[PDB]
Write a protein that binds this ligand. Structure first.
Ligand code: B12
Ligand code: SF4
Ligand code: SF4
Ligand code: NI
Ligand code: NI
Lengths: 424, 442, 313, 126
């Protein structure tokens, strides 16, 4: 009634819990228990539930516990179902908390857990068993750390550990896979028009004093590790942090992505260094770049298009500069028209260069990057009405690197960029 | 730069050393290269882009190959806005009226104060030889300095054109700084200095008088100028320097677009600590050539370190070389340590190891210039990188001593390092460098 | 040519430390440091002297020779500093509360601070150790004992900002230092946290970090420049508080100052190198935008005071 | 499709759409009301999914009562005047109002179907 929360002083576990225990490699012959991987079926899930469905501090172990093992190794399914209830708890916050599980388990010495969702495997050494470690301590640690780290969004936490072959698969089908599928569907179906607020991150201002990152559903943070949902979760959990909400009000150009509120926020955050920005263009007041960007996109005028280069590429580019020179010219929080720093998920976006005809202007790209991007790039170019395999029209470093050879390849292949209006 | 790209011939002939016209346009956009490098540029576009591309502040080169120093070329008022380009230089002031013992002491001070800090050689750059009234003794002094053997550049400070006409040929071939142009002798100084294209020092009473004198000198057609801010006091000199720089940059006025020379020995009245305070002030406050009464280690140690820090590119942190860095001649039975390629971190750990007086084989993997924690976060100072650097550097010279010390910040790397280095004994050390000596004594 | 008229919309707030006729005020400027030709500089930057609550064993020989007969008693040491040198303020550093060293209970350090604050008339700055958890309890007991003198408590980091803010500004009417590690965004975050707690800009000062010359100094310089430009040029209300820099904490600890002439014969006098390092670091931070500097050597205090007087006068 | 094809017969010179629209919140079925009331239920007390919080506020007197405003317009009354005046008076007197039909649409047009309306028109208890 008074919204009073009592914090847990220490984790009630016999095994010592410390952050320095991460990354410990523990001998194979000492592996008392091993769940997941190619041997057994293991999964983890954090799901939002109503207050009635989850009871506070209830650790339920279903199936045989690790004591029953009498052989040197162990092999049994493990399913961790975590239910969190709170006033501010949201489904979009579920993927964040679940990630911290990886860390919450690794801080316990004697147990090593790595993986994602149903791809996780956990190895428990016999030293923890001798100290007195059981499966209930998993729930104790998870509950304590969920109430510590996410105490502002989580009120009650219930952890269930399932070891029975039947209930582990039944709960995974009922709960786990639908959550994963709906999360993937939401990740893929989110566009800028659907949402009403963007986010602004200035975490890279420590080395780029003028850089402001604008995170939208179809424009990822150019570091590659911040998404729209990630920005929302960061704002909720850390209100005075680097991620702040930007209302999408006062539109000026829908095609070029110009908003008066966005310009005001960029001007305020960058301490006036940057005045006007465009989210969907690289030639009219482009967004700045800091230096964490994975890929650099540069305008090629003779091809009437754009070329791309990742940081792993060391050879020269048709622009005539390597990745180092492009990074020196582009980064640092300076507005440089014609050059952009971005992540790998932004290439196949419908907002990629929306102000200059879209992604159809991509004419050159490294071979490994093209192979990595080809599926989503072909999907988006099919949205453009191009052929089934649009990536074949994109020149590689092996096919041609000199500008004249690149233009010859584009003319031979009938690249759409040659038939568009002049880029600049 | 894209704007100048429109004016380029777009032949991509590679005749300028750059594969594409866009590359050349971006190279001249950054100011690294002037625009005269393109042979095929249209004449009109050249005539316009000369004015369009011309830097707002001119760079002046003084000295020969070994003593070549560039002063000027700044674009911003604060280093965080954009890097500071050319660092300030230090001069030691010799005077005609000084006696032989003082001159010998100052020559020895210049010679002795010379060291290296993180790959850069800290030493006195300029000898400011001033004229006090005796022409014969002034010529004797400049010849004596030239015969001493000190590796410094020369700055002649002489108001009399008659004395300068004889003093200049003594050090004319060394590209000196000719100082002493006024409102009544700049005509006689430009003709003396324009032949060999030497830098000319300009002084007057006040910013308005200085501006008028520089306008007259530019009307004469000479641009290789070094301005002297005036000011009968420290406050006035500071005001003049700040206002000259702000007029050049904020006002976009190229009349004040020249490096400034500040005689700190005259303002401080030869006070060592006041000289240090004012030198630190003018390192950050647009002073390009600071003249001091003397140079010792008490002056040099703070000033050169602060100059090295301030004139570091914000986007290009300083780095040390990679591989094995032998400390205290650590051959046979010496602990092995690993740290990050950061210049600051390497300097700290090397100093701590030197204080301990114990042999140490220090291995520096490639880390991107980031620190211990932020290099691991980026993905450079990983266990795989440390193991690969250990394998390739050649630390296998040792036989028995196999302890490998790791920074306490990266505790996750212990498992990976032990996995990739079964022979090595990975030991996680403490969290701070102050600890280095006491843990190594163990 | 047109004179550079740089008009700033922002203005740094004033914070008062101490009581009586010795109380000092920090901040109040609307221009860059020492830019008397652009407008109004609020208050002259202050210079304080550092003393320890225990005998200084790691200090250089000249410093121990200066305070030979007073360093044993912190009260006598503070009285000697106030009498002979008369600084703007005295920074009493509670080294004995360091968990790494000879860890002591908060009661002893609070008693020492209470004894010192009742013997001197100049404003007192009580600085804790580097441990946040120890700092919180220590400052609780120190602010409880030293009530009614308007002291300044250093190192209220984000980890323990609530504890030091409550035990300080809120309860016993003291001032506090919000400390952030060489970041403008972190300084903004700690200032916003202090404001949301209930502490306005008139009740705390800022510490954007300090470093000796040549040891991460450019980061301190850039942070000071960015904070000053945002507070004044951009009229950022979350950064319009005066900045205090402990210079002697790091400047005197480096190799260029600690090494004696025996260790490095070519370097020369140890005292001269220590004073030069202090003067260089203090001059840089003062030019970049700090409002108060803590120094150790009396000669450094004299030189820095003369430097400030020459620039402002 | 017939309606869409008629767009070609639009005469844009005869078009005048007043720039007067108002945000509204609706959808308050009994189930939705019960779901909203569940927020003010102490978990340790309960029960959940009942009208008990509403009954409690009515019995305690924090809310004086509940009134349903329904019905049409009528040229005999200044259109929407009586609906708006009745609703504002009731909510000012700490009477919670439920609306249906054309009265609900009058409330929507006026701006009463907004959370902000609580602090603009309602009495202290409401
Ligand atoms: C300065 C700094 C930066 C600067 C670095 C300046 C430079 N040129 O290196 C810049 C802006 C580049 C930077 C960037 C980032 N940073 Co940063 N950074 C820091 C900071 C403030 C201090 C690091 C530092 O300079 N240390 C001083 C150097 C000289 O020492 P050091 O290398 O750390 O080593 C010390 C000891 O280990 C010892 N030592 C070294 N070797 C050895 C060996 C032995 C045997 C021993 C005994 C001791 C020893 O010596 C030193 C002590 O004197 C920390 C804050 C903190 N709480 O730690 C954040 C911090 C490390 N940064 C952090 C992060 C996450 C980043 C970024 C990834 C994201 C961001 N913006 O915050 C980016 C990089 C993006 C990318 N991937 O490219 C996190 C790290 C979290 C983590 N994962 O561990 C911190 C804590 C900030 C935060 N909370 O977000 N950072
Ligand atoms: S690159 Fe990523 S971390 Fe940096 S400001 Fe943008 S979103 Fe934030
Ligand atoms: S010389 Fe001129 S035209 Fe030829 S490649 Fe260089 S910039 Fe292009
Ligand atoms: Ni970034
Ligand atoms: Ni970046």
């Amino acid at each position: 009634a008074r919204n009073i929360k009592i914090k847990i002083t220490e984790i009630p576990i016999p095994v010592s819990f410390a952050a320095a225990f991460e990354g410990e490699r523990i001998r194979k012959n000492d592996m008392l228990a091993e769940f997941g991987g190619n041997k057994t079926k293991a999964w983890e899930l954090v799901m939002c539930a109503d207050q009635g469905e989850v009871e506070d501090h209830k650790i339920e172990v279903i199936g045989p516990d690790i004591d029953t093992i009498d052989k040197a190794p162990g092999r049994m399914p493990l399913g961790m179902l975590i239910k969190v209830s709170g006033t501010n708890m949201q489904k979009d916050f579920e993927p964040v908390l679940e990630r911290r599980l990886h860390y919450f388990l690794n801080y316990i010495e004697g147990v090593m857990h790595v993986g994602q969702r149903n791809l996780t495997w956990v190895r428990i050494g016999k030293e923890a068993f001798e100290k007195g470690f059981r499966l209930k301590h998993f729930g104790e640690v998870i509950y304590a750390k969920m109430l510590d780290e996410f105490g502002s969004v989580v009120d009650k936490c219930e952890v269930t550990i399932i070891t029975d072959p039947g209930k582990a698969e039944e709960l995974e089908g009922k709960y786990a896979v639908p959550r994963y599928k709906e999360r993937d569907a939401r990740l893929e179906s989110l566009v800028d028009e659907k949402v009403d607020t963007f986010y602004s991150c200035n975490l890279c201002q420590s080395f780029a004093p003028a850089h402001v990152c604008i995170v939208t559903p179809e424009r990822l943070g150019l570091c590659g590790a911040v998404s729209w949902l990630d920005a929302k979760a960061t704002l909720e959990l850390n209100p005075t942090g680097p991620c702040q909400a930007v209302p999408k009000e006062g539109v000026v150009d829908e095609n070029l992505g110009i908003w008066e509120k966005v310009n005001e926020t960029v001007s305020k955050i960058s301490q006036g260094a940057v005045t006007s920005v465009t989210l969907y263009s690289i030639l009219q007041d482009p967004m700045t770049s800091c230096g964490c960007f994975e890929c650099i996109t540069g305008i090629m005028p003779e091809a009437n298009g754009v070329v791309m280069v990742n940081r792993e590429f060391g050879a020269t580019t048709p622009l005539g500069m390597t990745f180092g020179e492009l990074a020196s010219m582009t980064g640092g929080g300076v507005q440089t028209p014609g050059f952009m720093g971005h992540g790998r998920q932004f290439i196949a976006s419908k907002k990629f260069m929306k102000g200059e005809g879209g992604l159809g202007r991509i004419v050159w790209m490294p071979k490994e990057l093209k192979d990595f991007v080809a599926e989503k790039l072909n999907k988006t170019a099919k949205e453009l009405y191009n052929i089934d395999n649009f990536a074949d029209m994109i020149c590689d470093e092996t096919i041609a690197t000199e500008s004249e050879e690149v233009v010859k390849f584009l003319e031979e292949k009938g690249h759409p960029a040659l038939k568009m209006d002049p880029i600049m | 730069g894209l704007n100048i790209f429109k004016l380029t011939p777009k032949k991509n002939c590679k005749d300028c050393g750059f594969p594409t016209c866009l590359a050349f346009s971006m190279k001249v956009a950054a100011g690294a290269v002037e625009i005269g490098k393109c042979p095929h540029m249209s004449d009109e576009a050249m005539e316009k882009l000369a004015e369009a591309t011309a830097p707002i502040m001119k760079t002046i080169t003084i000295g020969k190959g070994d003593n070549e120093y560039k002063l000027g070329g700044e674009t911003v008022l604060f280093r965080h806005e954009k890097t500071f380009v050319n660092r300030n230089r230090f001069a030691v002031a010799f005077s005609d009226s000084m006696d032989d013992a003082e001159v010998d002491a100052k020559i020895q001070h210049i010679k002795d104060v010379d060291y290296v800090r993180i790959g850069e050689q800290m030493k006195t750059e300029f000898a400011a030889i001033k004229y006090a009234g005796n022409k014969d003794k002034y010529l004797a002094l400049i010849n004596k300095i030239k015969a001493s053997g000190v590796k410094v550049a020369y700055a002649l400070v002489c108001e009399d054109v008659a004395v300068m006409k004889e003093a200049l040929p003594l050090v004319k071939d060394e590209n000196p700084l000719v100082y002493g142009a006024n409102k009544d002798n700049f005509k006689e100084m430009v003709e003396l200095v324009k032949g060999d294209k030497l830098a000319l020092g300009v002084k007057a009473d006040g910013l308005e008088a200085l501006y008028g004198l520089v306008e007259e000198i530019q009307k004469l057609g000479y641009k290789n100028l070094v301005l002297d801010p005036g000011g009968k006091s420290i406050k006035e000199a500071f005001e003049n320097t700040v206002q000259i720089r702000r007029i050049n940059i904020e006002g976009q006025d190229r009349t004040f677009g020249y490096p400034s020379i500040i005689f700190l020995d005259e303002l401080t009245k030869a006070d060592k600590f006041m000289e240090v305070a004012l030198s630190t002030l003018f390192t950050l406050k647009y002073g390009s050539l600071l003249v001091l009464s003397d140079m010792d280690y008490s002056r040099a140690l703070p000033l050169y370190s602060i100059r090295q820090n301030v004139f570091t590119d914000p986007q290009k942190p300083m780095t040390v070389d990679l591989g094995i860095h032998g400390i205290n001649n650590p051959d046979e039975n010496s602990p092995v340590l690993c740290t990050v390629d950061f210049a600051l971190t390497y300097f700290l750990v090397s100093g701590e190891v030197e204080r301990s007086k114990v042999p140490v084989w220090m291995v520096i993997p490639d880390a991107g210039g980031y620190s211990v924690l932020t290099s691991w976060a980026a993905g450079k100072f990983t266990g795989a990188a440390i193991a690969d650097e250990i394998k390739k550097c050649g630390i296998a010279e040792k036989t028995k001593n196999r302890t490998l010390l790791i920074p306490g910040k990266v505790a996750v790397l212990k498992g990976e390092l032990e996995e990739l280095l079964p022979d090595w004994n990975i030991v996680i050390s403490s969290t701070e460098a102050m600890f280095i000596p006491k843990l190594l004594k163990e | 040519f047109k004179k550079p008229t740089q008009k700033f919309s922002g203005k740094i707030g004033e914070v008062e430390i101490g009581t009586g006729e010795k109380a000092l005020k920090l901040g109040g400027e609307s221009v860059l440091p020492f830019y008397t030709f652009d407008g109004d500089t609020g208050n002259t930057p202050k210079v304080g002297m550092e003393i320890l609550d225990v005998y200084p064993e790691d200090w250089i020989d000249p410093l121990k020779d200066i305070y030979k007969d007073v360093a044993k008693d912190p009260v006598k040491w503070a009285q000697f500093v106030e009498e002979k040198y008369s600084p703007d303020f005295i920074c009493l550093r509670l080294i004995s509360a360091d968990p790494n060293g000879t860890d002591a209970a908060p009661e002893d350090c609070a008693k020492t601070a209470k004894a010192v604050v009742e013997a001197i008339k100049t404003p007192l700055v009580v600085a804790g150790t580097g441990n946040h958890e120890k700092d919180a309890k220590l400052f609780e007991k120190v602010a409880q004992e030293t009530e009614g003198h308007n002291i300044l408590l250093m190192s209220a980091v984000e980890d323990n900002y609530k504890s030091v803010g409550a035990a300080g500004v809120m309860a016993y009417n003291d001032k506090v230092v919000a400390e952030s590690s060489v970041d403008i965004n972190l300084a903004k975050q700690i200032n916003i946290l202090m404001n949301q707690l209930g502490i306005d800009n008139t009740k705390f000062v800022d510490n954007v970090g300090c470093a000796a010359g040549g040891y991460g100094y450019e980061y301190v310089i850039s942070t000071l420049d960015r904070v000053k430009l945002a507070a004044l040029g951009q009229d950022d209300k979350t950064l319009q508080v005066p900045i205090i820099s402990p210079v002697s904490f790091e400047a005197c600890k480096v190799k260029e100052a600690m090494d004696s002439e025996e260790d490095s014969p070519q370097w020369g006098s140890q005292e001269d190198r220590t004073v030069s390092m202090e003067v260089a670091t203090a001059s840089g931070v003062l030019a970049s935008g700090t409002d108060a500097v803590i120094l150790r050597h009396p000669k450094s205090v004299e030189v820095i005071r003369n430097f400030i007087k020459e620039l402002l006068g | 499709k017939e309606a869409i094809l008629n767009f070609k017969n639009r005469d844009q010179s005869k078009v005048m759409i007043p720039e007067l629209k108002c945000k509204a919140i609706l959808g308050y079925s009994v189930e939705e009301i019960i779901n909203k009331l569940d927020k003010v239920v102490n978990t340790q007390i309960g029960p959940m999914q009942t009208v008990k919080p509403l009954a409690d506020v009515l019995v305690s007197g924090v809310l004086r009562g509940a009134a349903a405003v329904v019905g049409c317009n009528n040229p005999k009354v200044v259109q929407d005047s009586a609906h708006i005046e009745t609703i504002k008076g009731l909510i000012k007197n700490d009477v919670i109002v439920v609306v249906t039909g054309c009265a609900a649409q009058a409330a929507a047009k006026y701006g009463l179907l907004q959370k902000e309306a609580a602090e603009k028109y309602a009495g202290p208890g409401l």
